[PDB]
Amino acid sequence: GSHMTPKDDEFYQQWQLKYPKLILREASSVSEELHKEVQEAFLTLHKHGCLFRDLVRIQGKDLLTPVSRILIGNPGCTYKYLNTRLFTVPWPVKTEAEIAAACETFLKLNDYLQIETIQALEELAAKEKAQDEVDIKSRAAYNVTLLNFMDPQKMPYLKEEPYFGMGKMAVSWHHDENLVDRSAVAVYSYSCEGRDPDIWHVGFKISWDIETPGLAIPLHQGDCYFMLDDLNATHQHCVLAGSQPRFSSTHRVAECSTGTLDYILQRCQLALQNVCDDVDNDDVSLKSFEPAVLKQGEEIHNEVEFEWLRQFWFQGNRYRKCTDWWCQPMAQLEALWKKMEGVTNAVLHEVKREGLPVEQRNEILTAILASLTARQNLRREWHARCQSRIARTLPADQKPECRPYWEKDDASMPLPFDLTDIVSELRGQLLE
Ligand SMILES: O=C(O)c1ccccc1Nc1c(Cl)cc(-c2ccncc2)cc1Cl
Ligand SMILES: O=C(O)CCC(=O)C(=O)O
Ligand SMILES: [Mn+2]
C-alpha cells in the first residue's frame, strides 16, 4: 500500500476521477476578517479551558480521545458518537459574554460554510447531469460543530498509519457517524504554525480497500475541506499529525430525531399520560395497566435515564465551564425520571395485588421484564464505566458523576438502585 500527495503526478487525477465529492477551499478563498475572528475564538475557548478529552468506549474499552473537544450548535441539540452523547453549548440562533462571542463566531462560520456547501453541491449536480434542491438545502443545514484541539508534542508516541505509510496519525481511520443520510461535512482547519511530517494532513481511503492508494491532503492555516454526499459513508478518513498544534471545526448535520431536548421532553410527557396528575406527591396511581402502555412507560423510563441523565452527568458537569443552559433542563428530566421511578414502583405493586388473575399478571410481566432487565444491565455498565481506573485519573471538576445514585436506605427513592432481586423474582413468577 502507498499514498498520494500533491507531489505525486497521479494525485490530481486520482482526486478528480475518484474523489469528485471531496472539495478543498484554501485559506485564500475566505475573508481575512473571518480568519482572525475564528482563530481568536479558538484561542479564547482554549484559554478559558472549554475543550475536554472525552471518556469514550470502543469495543468494550474505555479510552480518552487524543483530541480535546467541545460541541457547539443549536440549543437543545445533541450529537452522539462512540457511545457518548455531547450536549451543545448553544450558539445565538433566533454563558459568559466572552465565551458567548466565540459561539456567535462559529455560528457565523457555520453560515458561511453552509453557503459554500450549497454552491458546491449545486455544481456537482450540474456535472452529474452533464425537489432535489430541497435535498441539497437539508444536506447542508449544519446544526452543530465539533471543535478539536491536539498538541502532538504532548503525546509520547502516536500510531503510525497502518496501510499506506502516511506516517503519524492523530485520529485513526473512521466514518463520522449518526449524521443525516448523505449530508455534507465542512471542516475549518487551523494549524497554529512520502508526505511531509511537519504539516497536518487529512487522509482518505475507500472503505474495505487498502489496495487503492489513499489520498493525503495537506491542510495549511485556514484551509477548508468538504465531504459531500455519500463520501463520508463510502470512504474513511483520518487525521495525520503535523509538528505544531492544530484546531479544527467540523460542521455537521447531526441526525437528532431522538436527540433534542424537545423530543425527550415529549417522550416524558407521553409516559406520564398514564399517571394521575392532579398533584406531585409520592402516591403515583396509574390509569391503565394495559401491557402496551406499561411497556412504553418503562421504555421511556430507560431512555431518559441512560440516554440523557447518565450521559450528561458522566461528563461531570463539564458544560459548567461554558454554559448553564442544560442545568434547568437536566434537573427537570431528573424530576420526570423520579416520577417514573414511582411509576415502576406502582406497577410492581399491581403485580403483587391479591385478586389480580394470574394471566392478567403474566401479560404485565411479559411487557415490562425486558425493560427492567435492560435497566439493571445498563446500570451495572454505567456504574462500572464511572469507576474505571482510567476515570479516577481525571481532575475533580471533570470526574464522572454516577448520577442518579442513591443508597439502599434512602427513603426518598421508592425502589433500590440494584434490581437483581426484583428482576429475578418477576421471571420466577412467569414460569411458576
Ligand atoms: O483515533 C484514535 O486513535 C482514537 C483513540 C481513542 C479514541 C478515539 C480515537 N479517534 C476517533 C475519534 Cl476522536 C472520533 C471518532 C468518531 C467521530 C465521529 N463518529 C464516529 C467516530 C473515531 C475515532 Cl477512531
Ligand atoms: O479533525 C478533523 O479534521 C476530522 C474530524 C474529526 O476528527 C472529528 O470530528 O471526529
Ligand atoms: Mn472526523
Write the DSSP string, 109-164.
HHHHHHHHHHHHHHHHHHHHH--HHHHHHHHT---EEEEEEE-GGG-S-PPBPTTT
Angle between helices 420-431 and 358-386 (to 10 degrees): 150
Fill in the amino acid letter for 108.
Answer: K
What pairing do the DSSP bridges indicate for beta strands 144-150 and 61-73? antiparallel
C-alpha cell at 417: 438502585
Ligand-binding annotation for 174, yes or no, is yes
| DSSP classification of residue 77 | B
- Is 212 strand, coil or helix? coil
Find the 202 Cα to ligand 1 centroid distance in Å: 14
Residue with cell 480521545: 65
- Is 181 strand, coil or helix? coil
Cis peptide before 218 (omega within 30 of 0): no
Find the 422 Cα to ligand 3 centroid distance in Å: 43
Nearest CA to ligand 2 atom 10: 176
Mutate to test the pocket of ligand 2, among 173, 226, 237 (most ligand atoms within 8 A of CB): 237
Whole-angstrom Cα distance, residue 82 to residue 415? 31
Write the DSSP string, 362-380.
HHHHHHHHHHHHHHHHHHH
- Is 295 strand, coil or helix? helix
Helix (H) or strand (E) holding 18: helix 9-18
Whole-angstrom Cα distance, residue 320 to residue 397? 10
Helix (H) or strand (E) holding 298: helix 291-302
69 CA closest ligand 2 atom index: 9
What pairing do the DSSP bridges indicate for beta strands 61-73 and 52-58? antiparallel
Whole-angstrom Cα distance, residue 96 to residue 126? 45
187 CA closest ligand 2 atom index: 3
Experimental method: X-ray
Show Cβ contacts of residue 54 under 8 Å, excluding neighbours closer than 6 positions.
64, 65, 69, 82, 84, 86, 315
Show Cβ contacts of residue 210 under 8 Å, excluding neighbours closer than 6 positions.
1, 163, 164
Please name which of 290, 309, 318, 291 lies closest in space to residue 403, comparing C-alpha atoms.
Answer: 309
Ligand-binding annotation for 389, yes or no, is no
159 CA closest ligand 1 atom index: 3
Whole-angstrom Cα distance, residue 102 to residue 72? 10
Nearest CA to ligand 1 atom 16: 176
Please name which of 48, 51, 85, 83 lies closest in space to residue 68, comparing C-alpha atoms.
Answer: 51
**The 3-state secondary structure of 234-271, one letter per residue:** HEEEEEECCCCCEEEEEEECECCCCCEHHHHHHHHHHH
Residue pair 1/211 in contact (Cβ under 8 Å)? The answer is: yes
